[PDB]
């Protein structure tokens, strides 16, 4: 039920002593969502620390991106400090500084009771492809969706209205479901629990619909799910089963069908019209090789969009064992970066090979030392 | 390399007060933030307070306004006055330190319990 965060501490740009650069803390696969994380410049916090709205993956496990303006000098050393409900103590991770496609629109929503606190804290935020365009922060001071992406801004006041309109009613639901769900599985009105909902369409290269999403946990648990055929549901256990049942007799499914296979395909079109200098953007990775038993490590940076493939092969075949890949992180721009590692005799690393696979490379580049 | 000791724990009644403190051995120039974190009845501890050697204080919400850090000057030494005490308050108070290396280290602790 609960999953240990994974922590990154990366610059955006190569460090370059007196150039200003970012520093980020990237934690991701965690859950609950409660988390602290700091920023620590030789032994002490940093003041100004910024993060990202909350997201998560299809595993449900959130991610979080803090990072702050830095010019790293030689002395300075730096550090990231995590503490989590899966930690005996706060994990701090130092700064090694000497280190053609789909389209997709994403709505991510979560839900987080707070007892004897006020309501619960609502996050919601947009996507299309990997580029954020819209959050929603129940704490935050606007109270109205927020645009967080420049080809947005461009629509009119109808437009922000109603999606605030909108965001608002997704807020009241989940909070009416968080007093349900307590309810179904008989759980104190003193404990925090946790509601995600998540849903979207895909397009292909065509722009024509491909599939759709709409999906329901509860605590990091699947709860209902939308089948891929958008006309019936799967359901996880006795409790969702009686709101499978009300969304059967409701004919939920056919009006969710309308809105994935239409109205998210015709705004998802003209976002990418609207956004094409960015969103219609690929931008191929920066790859690069670092170095009895020696470490090879295969890296790949500054890349658009995020789906990566990184794999090794001893002699041709894929080596699978004794290998270790890291989550592909964001810069913090609108880029990417990612590695990959693999223990090897020292005088051995030449019967070894890094192959990637990215949507902006005319074809997989092969690496070796 | 550096050792923390502390005292000040022990019982209190609620509404009471009490001082911790946690003195730092080693090197004067070899610790920078100093603070205390708790034990939860779970398996985490919380950030109650710290301060670094330049007198920037954090606290966690549930203590602030009731819960003052100090430094003095000369030893580094930090003092946490914890007034207005509850029983949710009870716990085992962790002094920890940050080397300018950001490097950490933890005391034993002392059990505080607010009847």
């Known amino acids: 039920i609960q999953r240990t965060p994974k922590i990154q501490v990366y610059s955006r740009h190569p460090a370059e002593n007196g150039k200003s650069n970012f520093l980020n803390c990237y934690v991701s696969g965690f859950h609950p969502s409660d988390i602290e994380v700091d920023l620590l410049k030789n032994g002490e916090r940093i003041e100004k620390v910024e993060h990202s709205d909350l997201s998560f993956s299809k595993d449900w496990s959130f991610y979080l991106l803090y990072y702050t303006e830095f010019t790293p000098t030689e002395k300075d050393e730096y550090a990231c400090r995590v503490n989590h409900v899966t930690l005996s103590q706060p994990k701090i991770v130092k700064w090694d500084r000497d280190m053609s496609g789909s389209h997709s629109m994403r709505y991510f929503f979560t839900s987080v009771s707070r007892p004897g606190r006020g309501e619960p804290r609502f996050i919601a935020v947009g996507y299309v492809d990997d580029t954020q365009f819209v959050r929603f922060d129940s704490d935050a001071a606007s109270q109205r969706m927020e645009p967080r992406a420049p080809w947005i801004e461009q629509e009119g006041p109808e437009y922000w209205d109603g999606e605030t309109r909108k965001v608002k009613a997704h807020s009241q639901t989940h909070r009416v479901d968080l007093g349900t769900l307590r309810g179904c599985y008989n759980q104190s009105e003193a404990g925090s629990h946790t509601v995600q909902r998540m849903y979207g369409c895909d397009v292909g290269s065509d722009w024509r619909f491909l599939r759709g999403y709409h999906q329901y946990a509860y605590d990091g648990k699947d709860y209902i799910a939308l089948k891929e055929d958008l006309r019936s549901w799967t359901a996880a256990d006795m409790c969702a089963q009686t709101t499978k049942h009300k969304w059967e007799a409701a004919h939920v499914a056919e009006q969710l069908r309308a809105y994935l296979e239409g109205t998210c395909v015709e705004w998802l079109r003209r976002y990418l019209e609207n956004g094409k200098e960015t969103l219609q953007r690929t931008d191929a990775p920066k790859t690069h090789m670092t170095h009895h038993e020696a470490t090879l490590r295969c890296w790949a940076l500054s890349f658009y969009p995020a789906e990566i493939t990184l794999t090794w092969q001893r002699d041709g075949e894929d080596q699978t064992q004794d290998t270790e890949l890291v989550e592909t992180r964001p810069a913090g721009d609108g880029t990417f970066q990612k590695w990959a590692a693999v223990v090897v005799p020292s005088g051995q690393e030449q019967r070894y090979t890094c192959h990637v696979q990215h949507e902006g490379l005319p074809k997989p580049l092969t690496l070796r030392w | 390399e550096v050792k923390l000791v502390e005292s000040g724990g022990g019982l209190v009644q609620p509404g009471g007060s009490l001082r911790l403190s946690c003195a730092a051995s080693?090197?004067?120039?070899?610790?920078?933030?100093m603070g205390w974190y708790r034990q939860t009845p779970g398996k985490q501890r919380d950030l109650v307070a710290d301060?670094?050697?330049?007198?920037?204080?954090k606290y966690g919400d549930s203590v602030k306004g009731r819960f003052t850090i100090s430094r003095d000057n000369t030893k580094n030494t930090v003092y946490l006055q914890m007034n207005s005490l509850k029983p949710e308050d009870t716990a085992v108070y962790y002094c920890?330190?940050?080397?300018?290396?950001?490097?950490?280290?933890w005391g034993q602790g002392t059990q505080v319990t607010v009847s």
């Open positions: 080693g090197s004067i120039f070899s610790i920078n933030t």
């Open positions: 920890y330190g940050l080397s300018y290396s950001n490097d950490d280290y």
């Open positions: 301060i670094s050697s330049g007198g920037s204080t």
